[PDB]
């Protein structure tokens, strides 16, 4: 009379309205009659953004015959190894936040994300920036697999747009040396900086330091920056609450009425994940969760609050889901 979806997320450490978006979707699914006549419930586990806790949660979900699918995890360094446990168990893992390209590069069959990867975000950013007249840019990046990853993706797409990367760097010691870098960048004709560092991983510090030194050029970053020195910052992300679409607007109004504040991109990704999984589960054999992955692929294009979703053979979401967001007066405007 009851079925369960597992959710693994750093619930306690983040004020990101993710739980609210999940809860709104579950309420909607139950109001419409549940899944195969059964009430839908969530089993929430907090991975504290820690790999060891994440792997333990993954095994606990995988060993529980009552879990039909899992939504999670948030951080790619947890989702990638946790996905091995879910994949070997034949249990769907659907991530609403992990953007590393590597997630879908391990031959897994049960592993999905319902948001664009870093590579798709980079591709759309390069297109936009070139149309805006960028020609010579600098990349500030984290010298790890994820930082090198997004940096190399952006450089490759920017090059195809006729943008030259005139310098890339991963460290500066103090503001004086950032001044010296900015002098070199001016001599190279710099017109913008792409920050391939996460906001919590040194990104925000650079933003503040850049303003101190007087760096004038546009700053561009990826999805961790969705979560007022930032005036004019361009962010490649997902979810447009101003999208003039019935589904997006029904969600925005419902979310506002229930929770008394605007939904975040994570509330939206969580909501679409629950709705997507419930639709696939309606049509599936609930006694065999290893059949659900094919059912998700069988949906083909599927309309959600984020836009149109579609899973490919590797589990990437190839829908046109990227939304470019620009900071104006402490608020994102939507391009
Ligand atoms: C929401 C982000 C901070 C998570 C990040 N996109 C990752 O893949 O790790
Ligand atoms: Ca199983
Ligand atoms: Ca050129
Ligand atoms: Ca350099």
From TrEMBL:
Coiled coil: none annotated. It comes from the Bacteria. Ca(2+) 1 binds at residue 89. The keyword Metal-binding applies. One of its GO terms (biological process) is amino acid transport. CDD domains: PBP1_ABC_HAAT-like. Ca(2+) 3 binds at residue 162. PANTHER family: LEUCINE-SPECIFIC-BINDING PROTEIN (PTHR30483), PERIPLASMIC BINDING PROTEIN OF ABC TRANSPORTER FOR NATURAL AMINO ACIDS (PTHR30483:SF6). Belongs to the leucine-binding protein family. This is Extracellular ligand-binding receptor. It comes from Desulfitobacterium hafniense (strain DSM 10664 / DCB-2).
């Amino acid at each position: 009379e009851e079925i369960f979806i597992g959710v693994a997320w750093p619930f306690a450490s983040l004020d990101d309205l993710f739980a609210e978006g999940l809860e709104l979707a579950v309420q909607e699914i139950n109001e419409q009659g549940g899944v195969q006549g059964r009430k839908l419930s969530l089993v929430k586990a907090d991975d504290e953004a820690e790999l060891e806790k994440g792997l333990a949660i993954a095994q606990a979900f995988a060993d529980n015959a009552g879990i039909q699918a899992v939504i999670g995890h948030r951080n790619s360094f947890i989702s990638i190894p946790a996905a091995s446990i879910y994949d070997q168990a034949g249990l769907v893992m659907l991530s609403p936040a992990s953007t590393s390209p590597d997630l879908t590069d391990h031959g897994y069959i049960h592993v999905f994300r319902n948001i664009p990867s870093d590579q798709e975000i980079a591709r759309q950013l390069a297109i936009y920036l070139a149309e805006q007249g960028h020609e010579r840019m600098v990349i500030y990046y984290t010298d790890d697999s994820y930082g090198n990853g997004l940096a190399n993706a952006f450089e490759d797409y920017a090059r195809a747009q006729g943008i030259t990367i005139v310098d890339r760097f991963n460290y500066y010691g103090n503001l004086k040396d950032l001044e010296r870098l900015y002098d070199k960048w001016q001599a190279f004709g710099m017109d913008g900086i792409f920050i391939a560092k996460t906001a919590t991983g040194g990104g925000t510090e650079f933003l503040v330091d850049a303003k101190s030194v007087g760096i004038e050029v546009p700053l561009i970053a990826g999805n961790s920056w969705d979560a007022m020195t930032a005036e004019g910052l361009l962010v490649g992300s997902f979810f447009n609450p101003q999208r003039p679409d019935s589904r997006t607007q029904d969600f925005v109004e419902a979310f506002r009425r229930e929770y008394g504040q605007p939904p975040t991109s994570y509330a939206a990704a969580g909501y679409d994940a629950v709705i997507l999984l419930a639709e696939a589960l309606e049509k599936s054999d609930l006694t065999h969760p290893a059949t659900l992955a094919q059912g998700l692929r069988d949906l083909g294009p599927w309309e959600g609050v984020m836009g149109m979703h579609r899973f490919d053979g590797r589990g990437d979401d190839i829908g046109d889901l990227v939304v470019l967001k620009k900071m104006k007066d402490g608020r994102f405007e939507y391009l």
